[PDB]
Design a protein around this ligand. Structure first.
Ligand code: HEM
Ligand code: ASC
Ligand code: NA
Length: 250
């Protein structure tokens, strides 16, 4: 669980701060914060703690990973971000993509996810099929987030709140529509729509519904719906862990 973060060079650090700034401008301009978060999440979410494979190590650069069914459309984000790597080539893709996720959350008014640089680009994309299945239930969530990634139940519910940004695209996952009425605003609305039941014009996956059906997940969703501050804190925490799965372990 413990971390021993590398001190990157002053050149590297400067590249990071300059990247963050370009990312803010880009993401706000193009209104692509949700897709950037999905990029960061899918880059990180392949981690498997038993084998020490996968995780946020730049492999989404490889068109092979971009070809996984779970990752349909991330090739747009990868292309979108390439001019940032071109201006700051010292940065690793792994850092670049995780930073873009952190910036995505910030630009939409979300909490400040700390960021520690130094991730190295690994050569080997992990095996496809580790990211969650939207049709499966609470026990699948714990398989992917817990047994694989190594995150907690609280993490599962908080991270699901990321669907407060963006929407499904038929051509990408086969689902359609947003979870909230403000897909460019990072807030706790996702839990409130969930707890409100299905309604016209808003998407809920079965993976979302599994939060209202489990004794641990449901109180957490209730708590996040009532108290955006506690949602922000727990999301900040989980997103930080997610972004550093397998990285700089002590
Ligand atoms: C149970 C876990 C999850 C499932 C089953 C799931 C599934 C999906 C699916 C099917 C889409 C549709 C993509 C499309 O068609 O455009 C989507 C989009 C998205 N996912 Fe999730 N996801 C999960 C967890 C997460 C997490 C942990 C995050 C970030 C913290 C996240 C952030 C997003 C975002 C921001 C989008 C919107 C992308 C856009 O608007 O272009 N998801 N997700
Ligand atoms: O989040 C997203 O941003 C882009 C587009 O909407 C704006 O560039 C993409 O297609 C989304 O899913
Ligand atoms: Na929202």
């Amino acid at each position: 669980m413990a971390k021993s973060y590398p001190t990157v060079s002053a050149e590297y650090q400067d590249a990071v701060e300059k990247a963050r700034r370009k990312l803010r401008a880009l993401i706000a301009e193009k209104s692509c914060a949700p897709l950037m978060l999905r990029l960061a999440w899918h880059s990180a979410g392949t981690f498997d703690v038993s084998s020490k494979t996968g995780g946020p190590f730049g492999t989404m650069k490889n068109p092979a990973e971009q070809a996984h069914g779970a990752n349909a459309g991330l090739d747009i984000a990868v292309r979108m971000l390439e001019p940032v790597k071109e201006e700051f080539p010292i940065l690793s893709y792994a850092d670049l993509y995780q930073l873009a996720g952190v910036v995505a959350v910030e630009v939409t008014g979300g909490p400040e996810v700390p960021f520690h640089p130094g991730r190295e680009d690994k050569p080997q994309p992990p095996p496809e099929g580790r990211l969650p299945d939207a049709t499966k239930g609470s026990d699948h969530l714990r398989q992917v987030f817990g047994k694989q990634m190594g995150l907690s139940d609280q993490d599962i519910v908080a991270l699901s709140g990321g669907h407060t940004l963006g929407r499904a695209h038929k051509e990408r996952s086969g689902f359609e529509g947003p979870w909230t009425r403000n897909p460019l605003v990072f807030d706790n609305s996702y839990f409130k729509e969930l707890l409100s039941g299905d309604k016209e014009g808003l998407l809920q996956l079965p993976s979302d519904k599994a939060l209202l059906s489990d004794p641990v997940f449901r109180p957490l969703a209730e708590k996040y719906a009532a108290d955006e501050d506690a949602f922000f804190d727990d999301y900040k925490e989980a997103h930080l862990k997610l972004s550093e799965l397998g990285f700089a372990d002590a």
